[PDB]
Symmetry: D2
Subunit: 364 residues, 4 copies
C-alpha cells in the first residue's frame, strides 16, 4: 500500500532505507491486533478494537539497558518506567504501546514473559516494564478484557526488524487522529553530522488532534476534503453537518540528558501539523540510543562522545527528530483505513484520492 510520499506529499530531509524506526540497527517491532464483534457494546463482551505494539531497543534477547530520556507535551496519560528513565537515564526490556484499558495486563504479562527466559539472578531487572497508552474508547470495549497475556506474548516473541506495519495495527488498532482514523505511523531520517551520518527513527501511536487544525505539508487540509466525517449508525457525528505516543530511536551515542533534548524536539514536529494539545490528550515522547548501551551489572559502553554545544552535530540530529515526527504522523493517517467498531461508530481513513489531488494542485 502507498505511504504518504506515494500520494504526492512532500517532506524535507533524507529518509533511511525503510523510512521506519527499524532503520536504526537492532530495533525490532511487533504488533498483536485484536478485532472482533460488531454492533452494540456490552462491557466484558466487546466489540473489541485494540492491541499492543512492542519495540525491543536492542532486540528481544537483550538483557541490557539503553540510554534514554523523555519529554512531556501534556501529561494526561500513563507511561510506566519513566521515573526510572528520569533517575538513572536508562530502561531495561521492551517498550509496549497499547490501549488504556490494557496497561495492567501488559505490565504483568511482561514480567511473566521474563520468567524462564531470564537468569534468576537478573530477574529483578525485569520488574519495571515500560508500558504506555492512548484511549480507544470510541471503537473499543475498553474495560472488557479483550487483550490476553497470549496476545502480549505473541507481540513480544513475533517482533522483528525490517519494514514496519502501519495503520490499524497493535496499540493503534482502535485509535482516532485529527477526526480521521488513528493508528501507528513511522518514519526515519539519515542526518549528516560533519563526516558522520546518524540515523534517527520515529514511531508514533496517534490518537490526537482535530480535523480543523490539521496541516499536511503546511496545507490546512481539513476544509479541502469533502465528507469523511465520523458517523454513528449512519448519522454524521461531527463537523458542520452533524493523546499521542512518540518513540524516538537513534544510533548516535548520546548521554541521557542529551536524549531528553531529542525528545523535547518532538513537540516542534507535532506543531508543524497543526494540533494544539487538548486538555485530556496525553502527549509524550521517549528517546533512546542503541549505541550507548549498559550491560546488566557492567560498565556502560559509549563508543564516542558528543559535545552539547556542537551545533553541526546536534542540529542535524534535532532536525532529524522534527522531520521524522512530522512524516510519521502523516504516514499514520495514510496507512489507517476506515473502520466501524463499538456501538457502530464509524471513523474514516483520510481519503487517498482527495489527498493526492490536493497535493498535486498545491505542489505541481
Amino acid at each position: 500500500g502507498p505511504r504518504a510520499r506515494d500520494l504526492g506529499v512532500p517532506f524535507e530531509g533524507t529518509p533511511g532505507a525503510l523510512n521506519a524506526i527499524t532503520d536504526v540497527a537492532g530495533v525490532e517491532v511487533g504488533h498483536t491486533t485484536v478485532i472482533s464483534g460488531d454492533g452494540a457494546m456490552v462491557i466484558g463482551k466487546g466489540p473489541y478494537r485494540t492491541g499492543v505494539t512492542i519495540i525491543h531497543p536492542l532486540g528481544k534477547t537483550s538483557l541490557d539497558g539503553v540510554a534514554a530520556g523523555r519529554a512531556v507535551i501534556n501529561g494526561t496519560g500513563e507511561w510506566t518506567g519513566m521515573h526510572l528513565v528520569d533517575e538513572v537515564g536508562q530502561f531495561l526490556g521492551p517498550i509496549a504501546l497499547t490501549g488504556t484499558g490494557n496497561v495492567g495486563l501488559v505490565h504483568q504479562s511482561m514480567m511473566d514473559w521474563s520468567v524462564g527466559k531470564v537468569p534468576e539472578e537478573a530477574l529483578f531487572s525485569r520488574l519495571l516494564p515500560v508500558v504506555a497508552e492512548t484511549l480507544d474508547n470510541r471503537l473499543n470495549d475498553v474495560f472488557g478484557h479483550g487483550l490476553t497475556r497470549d496476545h502480549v506474548f505473541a507481540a513480544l516473541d513475533g517482533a522483528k526488524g525490517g519494514p514496519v506495519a502501519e495503520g490499524n495495527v497493535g496499540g493503534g488498532t482502535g485509535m482516532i487522529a485529527y477526526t480521521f482514523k488513528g493508528g501507528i505511523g513511522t518514519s526515519s531520517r539519515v542526518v549528516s553530522a560533519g563526516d558522520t551520518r546518524y540515523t534517527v527513527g520515529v514511531l508514533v501511536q496517534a490518537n490526537h488532534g482535530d480535523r480543523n487544525d490539521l496541516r499536511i505539508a503546511g496545507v490546512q487540509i481539513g476544509k479541502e476534503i469533502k465528507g469523511a466525517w465520523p458517523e454513528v449508525n449512519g448519522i454524521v457525528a461531527a463537523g458542520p453537518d452533524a493523546s499521542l505516543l512518540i518513540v524516538i530511536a537513534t544510533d548516535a551515542p548520546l548521554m541521557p540528558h542529551q536524549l531528553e533534548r531529542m525528545a523535547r524536539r518532538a513537540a516542534l514536529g507535532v506543531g508543524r501539523n497543526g494540533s494544539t494539545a487538548g486538555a485530556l490528550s496525553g502527549e509524550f515522547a521517549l528517546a533512546f540510543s542503541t549505541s550507548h548501551v549498559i550491560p546488566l551489572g557492567g560498565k556502560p559502553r559509549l563508543p564516542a562522545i558528543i559535545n552539547d554545544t556542537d551545533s553541526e552535530t546536534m542540529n542535524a540530529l534535532f532536525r532529524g527528530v522534527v522531520q521524522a515526527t512530522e512524516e510519521a504522523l502523516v504516514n499514520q493517517l495514510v496507512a489507517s483505513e476506515t473502520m466501524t467498531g463499538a456501538n457502530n461508530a464509524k471513523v474514516y481513513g483520510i481519503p487517498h484520492d482527495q489527498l493526492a489531488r490536493i497535493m498535486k494542485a498545491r505542489f505541481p
Copy 2:
C-alpha cells in the same frame, strides 16, 4: 501493642488524636495481608509474604478528585498516575501501595472494581489508577502471583477511618528497613497558623536504609543494639558469615504547586533518620488536600486560599510534614515483628527491650 512513643522515643510537635493519616477527616485505609507457606521458594508456589494497602483520599464512595503534587528523592521504582498529577494537579480514585511484582495486577483490579460502581459516563475517569511499589524480594515469591484480584477488592472494600494497623501488613508485609523488619508506619501533626489549625497526616511503606545509618531521635542506634541481624547464617553486621513510599494527607486548602512543596519536605524528615538514598532505592512522596476537591466534570472547590509567601502558615505545614515523616518511619520499625519468609530468610523487628533501655538512658 506499643508504638514508638510508648517505648520512650521523644518526638517534636503535636500529634493528632489517632497519630495517623486518618486524623485527616474522611481518609480511609485498608490492608490485605498475604502470608502463606514456609521453606524453600519455588517461583509460582511461594512462600508468599506480600499484600496491598489502599488509601481512599475522600472515602471509598467518592468519584471526585483531590488536588495533589509529588516529589522524588530517588526515582528507581514505579508510581502510576504521576504524569497526571504533574500535569493537571489532581488524581481520581484510591492510592495503592504494594510489592513490585503486584503492580499490574493491582492496576487492572482497580479498573475492574469501578465497573458497576461508577456510572458508565464517568468510567473514563477511573482509567489512570495510582499504584506504587517497593520490592519484597528477600521474604516473598515476587513473580509467583501470590496476590489476587479478590485480595485487592477486599482492601478497597474494607478500608475505613479510625486507627490504622502498622507493621507487617498490606503492602509492607514482606519489607525490610534499616536491616530490621520493614513495613507500614503512620503518624500525624496538628499545626498552628495564627488562629487556624490544620492536620498533616503521613503513611509510609518502608523498605529502605542501612542499620549502621539509622538514627532514632537523633541517636545513631544500630551499634547500640546487640544481635537482631538478619539470617539467610548471619547475613550482615560484624558476625556476617556465622525503597520508601510516603503519602501525605492534609486538610489545608492547598493548590497543586503548593502540595509539591509539601511533598519536597518529606526528604528532610527522611534525612533526620540517617539514610542516604541507595542507588536502587525508589524513594517517592505524594501529597494531597482533602479540602481542595474537584467534583468530576464540575467546578473545583477551594474553601480558602493561602499565600505561598505567608511564612507563618506555610512553615507550620512544612514542619508538620517533616516531623510526621520522621515519626512514621520510627512507628513502622516498632510495629514490625520478626518474620521468617521465603527460603527461610529471617529478619528481626527492632528489639523493643533494647530500644526502650537506650531511650531511657539517652533521655532520662
Copy 3:
C-alpha cells in the same frame, strides 16, 4: 506601517482590538532602543544596536504579584526570577527582555528603580527581578556597556498600554531571526470558553531559526524569496550564493492557577513548530505565562475571581489554541515589522521583503 495581515498573510482565530499583548487589560509595554555608531567594532566603543523591553503585568505602579508558570524549549540562555516562579507560582515586578550583555546592568537597575518608589517595608519583594536575554552578537558590541541605567529607567517609566511598537526596538533592536532581521513581535486572541470570552496576548523577542526552515501560513517561503541574504562589507554571508534564541511572554485574563499557567507556556512550542524552526543547540528558547486576574497582594490573601477545572476541555482547549495561534502570528508580525539594518562591523541583515511576501501570499491564498 503594515503588519502581517496587511500583507495578505492569513491566520486562524479572532485577534483582540489591538492584536497585541496589551489587549490584556492593565498590561503596559515600554521600549528603549539604542542605535549609535557605524563600521568596525571595538569592544567598549560600539557600534551599538541593543536595548531593553519592559512588560509590567499589572502596570508600573503595582507592588502585587501575578500567578505564573513557565516552559523550556531549549534552555541555553538566561531568564532570572524563574526559580521563584517554579517554587511559589508567582513573580513580582516587571519582565525585562534584553541583549545578553545587558542582563546584570538591567537586574541591578530594576533594584535601584524600586528605591524611593517602594515602601522600605516592601523592598525585599523587589530583590528577584525578572530579566531574560537573546544574543545580538552580529550587530551589536555585546560587552561594550552600550546600555545605561538611564536607558532602563526610561523603559520602566515610559511603558504604557495601547498599541505596541514592533520590529527593531527595545530588546529586539539588534536581533536576527530566520536569517532575516529579528526583533519584537506581538499578537492576541479572544477565545470563547462557553459563555465567557478570555483574552490571550503574546509578545516575542525573536533571534531564532533558519531561512530554509521558515514557514509562513504553512508556506516554506525561504526559497521563494529572491535575494535578501545577509552581507558583510558587501559580501553575501549566507545562503546558496555566499561570497558574492527566542523569548515568549504570554498574558491572559483567564483566572488560572500556577500549574495551569505552566500548561499555557508549554503550548508555545506548538506555535513555534508551525513556523518551521527546530530549536538549535545554543538557541535559548523559553516561554513565561501569567494571569492578570489571579493576583497576589503583597503579604495578603491571593485573589482568584473564579476557578477553572483542568479537565474542562471546552475552556482549556480554547485557551491553549489561543496561545498557539497568537504565538504563530506574533512571530510573523515580528519579521514584517523589522527593517533592514547595518550594524557592528558593517554586518547587514535584511528585513523580509514586503513586496515579495505579499506577492507570494496572493499567489497562494487568492
Copy 4:
C-alpha cells in the same frame, strides 16, 4: 580557630586532608569580605556587611566547562546559569556566591573580567555567568551598592587551592543561620568504591534554619545553649526572653560522572540538611549544584570522560551519595563554629554559637 571536630563534635566517614572543597584537586576558592560602617542604616551609605565568594571548578585560567547537575529544596532565590546546566549538563566559568543585592553587579563584573583574558573568539562562552544569592538584610545595607567591580575582580584573581577560610567571609559575611551567625562552611569525604577512591567536597553559604530545630550530631541543641539570642534595637529579638534587654550548597567531585548522575548527587544534599533539623522555610531559597572535575568539556572540543560509572552500581554510587550527605552535614556545623559574633546595620547583633557551651554538651553526650 577551632573547627567542629576540634570542639568534640563527632561525624561519620573519612574527611580529606584539608577537610574542604579544595580536597578536590584543581578547585580554587576566593573571598572578598566587605565590612565597613557602624550604627543606623541609610540606604546607599551602609553600614555594609557583605561580600562575594568565587569557586573556579578547574582553576582561574580554565576556559573549559565542567559536567554539572543541580537540585532544588526550595526555590525562592536566584542562581543564574542554571537553565544552561539543566539543558546541556555543563557550565563555563566560575561560581559566585553573594548577597541578594549584589547579583547584577557580580554578573556584569564577571563578563567584564573575561574581556582581555579570553580570546575574542571565545567571549560568547563567558556570557552566562553563574551567580547565586542569600539575603543579608539584617546586618547589611542590601540596596546600597556596597560591593564594587574591584571587589569581584579581587576574589576572581585571588582565588586559590589549599585551606578555605570559613565563617564571616565572602558571600557569607552578613548571613544568619539557625538564629546564630551564618556564613561559609566547608568539608570533604574520601570515599571507597572497591579499590577505587574518590573525593567529594562541599562548600555552603548558610542563611537558613531556626535555633529550635537545630541538631548537631543528632543532639537538639538550641534549648541546651543558654543565652546568645540575637538583639535588635538593644532588645533580645528571639527566644524565651524576646522583648527584654536560604542555603547555597556547592558539591565538587573528582568522580567521572555524567550530568544526570550529578543531579543525583545534588539531590543528596537535602538528606544532609535534614540531619541537622531545618525544615526549609517558605522564603528560604535552598539549592544545590554538583560538578565533576574529571568530566571536562574543552571549549568547542570533544568531552573528556576518563572512566564511566553505571547508575545501578550500588557499591560505587552509594559511596558517593553517602559522601555528599556526610560532607553537607559537617560543612553546616563547620560554618556555625567558624562564624563569630557580629554587630551590623542598625546595631543588629547576632551571636556565633558559643564554643564553650557546645564543647561541654558534646563532651557530656559523647564521653
